[PDB]
Every structure is written in C-alpha cells, then in structure tokens.
C-alpha cells in the first residue's frame, strides 16, 4: 500500500507466503566478564559463543489462507467436455483462485541461506533473437532476501522477465522471483557454515486441469496424430497446467513449539557462530488464514445495500525466538592463526589477537612503475572492499544484545535443558 501520487508505502505488504529472515546479533563475549573469570587468560585467548539448542514459538490458531487472480489465462475444463470447445476470442481470462502447497521448513547457520531459481541469460550469438523467440534458460544462485516467495509448485524463476502476460499466475508471486533452497550446493560448502542443520515437510496433490489460451508457439508434427475435420478441423491448444491443492492439515505434522537438540551436524562447525552473528530462516503455510472485516460508511439506513460497506484485508503474524547458548575458548598458535586466516580473515578484525599481528604477510608480485602522474599510462585508483558487505541485502532485524540471563531456572524453555541432562542442582 502506498500513497497514489507518492512512492512512499502506506502499509507494508505481508503474507505468510513471504519468506522470513531473522538476523540476530550477539554481544561480544569478550567484552563481557564472568562471576569468576580466573579460569582463562583473556590475553592469550578469546571467547566465542556456541548454539546448543533452538526453539520457534508460533501462537496463532491454525488455518489455511488462499489467493487468486481476477484475470487468468484459461480456456475451459479439460476434465470432462461433452462437445468440442468454442472458438478462441480475445481475453477469456476469468476470476479463479487456488490454494498453495502446504509446507514447513527450518534453517539455521552463520551464513545466509543460499537460493536458486530459473532465469534468463544471454543467448549465444548465431541467430539474432526476434521478438517471440524462446528465451534460453539459466540456473542462478543468489542470496535470499526477506519478502521473497515460496514455490507454489510452479518452480523458482522470474515471472516478471520470463512471463510477459503477467496474468499467468495469482498475484502474490507475479511480481517477484519465487526461490527454493538447494541442499546440495549449500551442504556442499567446504566449511558447511552456510547451514549446519535443517528440517522440512511438505505435500501437494492435484485438483483441476486447465489450458492456456494464446498464440501457439509450435504445433506438434502431424505424424503424431491424424487430421481431424468439422469440429476437428482445428487443434485446440496443447498446453496444460495443474492446479495445486493443499491437503488436510494436522496438529501433528507441525514441526514447531517443540525443542531441538544439536550435537553433530553435517558441517564441521559444531554450533560455532562467528562474528557474534547467527541466522535463522523459517517459513510456514499453516497460519495463512486471512481475516476480512467490513466498515460501514453510513450507519443509519436500515435497508441493506452493497454500497455501504468497504472491505479490507489484513493478515496475522506471530513469531518468537528462544536460543540456548554455550561458551567456549580458543588457544592461539601459528597453525591456529593461519588456519583461521585462511577461512575468513575478516573475523580477525573484530578481535585483537592483539593487533598489529597478521596485517598481511604477502610481499607483492611487483606491480610498480610510476608513483605520480597526469600524463603516462592508465592506472588504478578504485580500491575499497565494502566493510559492511551485506548491508545491500535488506531483511528483518532483531537485537538481543541486552537480554541475556545467567540462570536457566527462571525460563520456560531452559528447565527442559536441565531435564534432558537432569542435574537438578543448578551449577
């Protein structure tokens, strides 16, 4: 929602099918003393947080929402037809809606979740592209941003570029690029620090069978059938697409409101969150319910009229986060320092070591020549490497910095952490 003349948003667009992205800061442990700090040297070493266990609270009453589009390319029912269809007019689009595939997932790690989608690249140049050609396809990884859309079962791609009609799908997805996680490339990471853990459940089934209506891109070669006549003189459009249909939802398949416990993950990180930083990304279809209310512009007249009532739509959203954490130290040697500095050197900035110490070791390869000039050859003066790199990438934010407490007992979640390990006397 935005002011009509302005570009400024009046109301933010939100629905369940938007992905969620949570970024969570932690205060530096090493700024942060202890009741008894004697057990380590803070000089020769450091302190770094670790994430043992995680919860996701969700409080709404469970129910399914939905979407549609007023204009949709459609021919007619393909399921049962007494007689052959009618002649194709101009713009037979109709108002029809459908339910999206029910889905649940969870994502955790220190590096942003990596996405992928279909999309258009540049055709190799032999044939000059004429309007109406089939644009070639390309597989593209990208960082995942908030507000992005789950698949509905139409697959990750850019409708905006690849779909000109702009009417071929219901609204919510028409604008953006629905995206989907690739477990492979992610888990293929050498450090695994993208994500160390995850869970997913989803299901779908067919409901209806329809036809696109539009200019035929290609006709099947005849030999795959036999010529018609009369009503069969002409071939109806070849296209079809299913209508995805959500199923019965249960309280059981809910993956939330229940604790988790991590020890070993497919990645070599064990719950280490570098740079005091941690990521969670979660998406649910189950709360999608859309309440609808009506306002009366005139309260007097006693005869019902469709004139008196405007209609609006707002959607509920409820999250909670509770994170266990563990505390850890690091010894320093060369091998250590080396091995880290390889992995991500930016990490070492926010610490001291004590710092001068690895401010680059590498002698240059000797690119050299004039140190002045306005006259002789071109030279470089670009360099800066963008120290808050991902600030380009917007997404939802929460600060915890202030909230830590030192006693599990006082919280609902924690005492379970005790119970799992027992030990009824709090250390």
């Amino acid at each position: 929602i935005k002011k009509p003349n302005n570009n400024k948003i009046l109301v933010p667009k939100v629905s369940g099918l938007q992905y969620r992205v949570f970024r969570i800061h932690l205060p530096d442990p090493n700024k942060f003393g202890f009741p008894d700090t004697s057990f380590y040297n803070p000089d020769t070493q450091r302190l770094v947080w670790a994430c043992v266990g995680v919860e996701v609270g969700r409080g709404q009453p469970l129910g399914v929402g939905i979407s549609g589009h007023p204009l949709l390319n459609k021919l007619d029912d393909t399921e049962n037809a007494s007689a052959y269809a009618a002649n194709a007019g101009v713009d037979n689009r109709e108002c029809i809606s459908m339910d999206y595939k029910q889905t649940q997932l969870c994502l955790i790690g220190c590096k942003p979740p990596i996405g992928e989608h279909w999309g258009k690249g540049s055709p190799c140049t032999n044939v000059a592209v004429n309007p109406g050609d089939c644009p070639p396809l390309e597989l593209i990884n990208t960082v995942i941003q908030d507000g992005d859309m789950v698949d509905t079962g139409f697959g990750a791609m850019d409708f905006t570029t690849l779909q000109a009609n702009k009417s071929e799908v219901p609204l919510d997805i028409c604008t953006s690029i629905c995206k989907y996680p690739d477990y492979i490339k992610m888990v293929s990471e050498p450090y695994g620090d993208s994500l160390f853990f995850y869970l997913r459940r989803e299901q779908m089934f067919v409901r209806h069978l329809f036809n696109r209506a539009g200019a035929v891109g290609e006709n099947v070669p005849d030999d795959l059938y036999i010529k018609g006549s009369g009503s069969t003189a002409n071939l109806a459009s070849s296209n079809y697409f299913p209508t995805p249909s959500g199923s019965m939802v249960t309280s059981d398949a809910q993956i939330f409101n229940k604790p988790y416990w991590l020890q070993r993950a497919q990645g070599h990180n064990n719950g280490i969150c570098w740079g005091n930083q941690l990521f969670v990304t979660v998406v649910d279809t189950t709360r999608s319910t859309n309440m609808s209310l009506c306002a009366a512009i005139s309260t007097s007249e006693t005869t019902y009229k469709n004139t008196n009532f405007k209609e609006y739509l707002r959607h509920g959203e409820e999250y909670d986060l509770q994170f266990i954490f563990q505390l850890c130290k690091i010894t320093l040697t060369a091998d250590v320092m080396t091995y880290i500095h390889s992995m991500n050197s930016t990490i070492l900035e926010d610490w001291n070591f004590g710092l001068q110490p690895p401010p680059g070791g590498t002698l240059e390869d000797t690119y050299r020549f004039v140190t002045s000039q306005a006259i002789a050859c071109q030279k470089h003066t670009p360099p800066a490497p963008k120290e808050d790199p991902l600030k380009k990438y917007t997404f939802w934010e929460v600060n915890l910095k202030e909230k830590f407490s030192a006693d599990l007992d006082q919280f609902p979640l924690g005492r379970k952490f005790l119970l799992q390990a027992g030990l009824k006397a709090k250390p």
Epitope: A83, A88, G89, V90, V216, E218, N219, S229, G230, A233
Partner: antibody, heavy 122, light 114 residues
Framework: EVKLEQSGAELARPGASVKLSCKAS????????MQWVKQRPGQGLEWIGA????????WYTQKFKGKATLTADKSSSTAYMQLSSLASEDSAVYYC???????????????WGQGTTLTVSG | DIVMTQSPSSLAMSVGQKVTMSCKSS????????????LAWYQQKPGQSPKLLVY???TRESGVPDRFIGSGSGTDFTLTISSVQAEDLADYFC?????????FGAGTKLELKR
C-alpha cells in the same frame, strides 16, 4: 489496418525461377497461417497450400507437391513464394491473401490481397 | 478431395427479380452437432478483387443487404437473391471450408437483361 502489398509482375524463361511478395500491416505478421491461390482464367480459383511463419510449417497439396516451395521472414513482414523450373501453363495470376484461422474463427477468408500476375515463358 | 458443382452457368434477368443459383457437391457440408455448413459465397466483379459474401448457410456478413440471403440445407445448397439492381451484376463463387485441402466451386456468371 488490414493491408497486403501483393506486388510486381513478371515474364521469364522456361525452367527458370520466380519470386513473389506480400507484406503486412496492422497485426502480427508471423502469428497465423497464410495462403497462395492461383488464378487462371477459365479455371481460376485453386488453393496451393499454406504456411505458418511461426516455424514456417508447410502444406503442399498433391498438385504442387515438389515444385512449389514456400518460406517467409517476419522481420521483413513480407510473404514469399519460391517456384522454379517454370512452364507454359504456369502463366496466370497468383492472387493471395490471409484467412483468419485463429482470430476467433476457422477457415475460409476475411480478405483478398492486391493481386499479381505472372507470365511464362517470354 | 471432394468436388463441388456450381450451377447454373449464366442467367439473364431484370431488376428486382428473385434469382437462385444452385450449389452441389458430393459429401455433406453439414452434420449436426454445431450443425456446421461449410459452404462459402464470394462476389467478384470482373478484373477487381474478390470479396467475401456468406459462409456457413445463414451467415449475413457486415455490409450486405438482404438482396443476398443464404439458402440450401443438407448437402447441396442454393443462394436466394431478393431484388437485383445494376450493381449486383458480378461473377459469384461458392466453395468449401472443410477437410483440407480446400475445394472450390466451378463459377457463377450472371447475365444481364433485355
């Protein structure tokens, strides 16, 4: 709006090759089937075949199987008819237009082109 | 591969008279589901460009007074013509939209008067 340029006239030698053109206005040139119709006095209307510029798929009636050939280019937005190895009775009017096929319709015709006449041999 | 028969060859006539040419062909232009008739009608005055008159059977094309009204049913058909003026003289054609390839009528040449 609806317009076709059916242009030229020609006289040529036996066994030679010929060329024809029909051009588009007020629609998408490549989005439908197209026609070529031979007009010979005393016989007249005859349906050669049809071509759909989208891929340029073809239809060749038993008569014109072989010798007749059809292609077009949409950047030109102009029809072509390529015929070779001429003959005397080939002399006639080739008078063609575009039926609506799609267009919320089927066969027969909404239109007739300009007309063009070919004479062989010289 | 079917064949159309277009008759009569020529008819002289006078103003306002009601004249009917005949349409004849082998198979049925017509079966009943959509009750489609594949007959066509074309007017060509000599030397100029032909044009569409009537398709199906009961079609009335935009720009045609009732001086032309379709007729014929079943297989072989006719054209009813109500009242003829001088401009109505022309060379008619009736042909077929069905079962590729296409098939045409022989020809229809109206003869004038006196």
């Amino acid at each position: 709006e609806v317009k076709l340029e059916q242009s030229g006239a020609e006289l040529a030698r036996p066994g030679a090759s010929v060329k024809l053109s029909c051009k588009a206005s007020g629609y998408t040139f490549a989005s439908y089937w197209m026609q070529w119709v031979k007009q010979r006095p005393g016989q007249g209307l005859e349906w050669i075949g049809a071509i759909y510029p989208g891929d340029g798929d073809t239809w060749y009636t038993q008569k014109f199987k072989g010798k007749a050939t059809l292609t077009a280019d949409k950047s030109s937005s102009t029809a072509y008819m390529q015929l070779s190895s001429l003959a005397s009775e080939d002399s006639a009017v080739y008078y063609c237009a575009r039926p609506p096929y799609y267009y919320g319709t089927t066969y027969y015709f909404d239109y007739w082109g300009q007309g063009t006449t070919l004479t062989v041999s010289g | 591969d079917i064949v159309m028969t277009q008759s009569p060859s020529s008819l002289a006539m006078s103003v306002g008279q009601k004249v009917t040419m005949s349409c004849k062909s082998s198979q049925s232009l017509l079966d009943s589901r959509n009750q489609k008739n594949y007959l066509a009608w074309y007017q060509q005055k000599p030397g100029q460009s032909p044009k569409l008159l009537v398709y199906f059977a009961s079609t009335r094309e935009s720009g045609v007074p009732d001086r032309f009204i379709g007729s014929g049913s079943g297989t072989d058909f006719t054209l009813t013509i109500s009242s003829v003026q001088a401009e109505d003289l022309a060379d008619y054609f009736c042909q077929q939209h069905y079962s590729t390839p296409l098939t045409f009528g022989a020809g229809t040449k109206l003869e004038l008067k006196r």
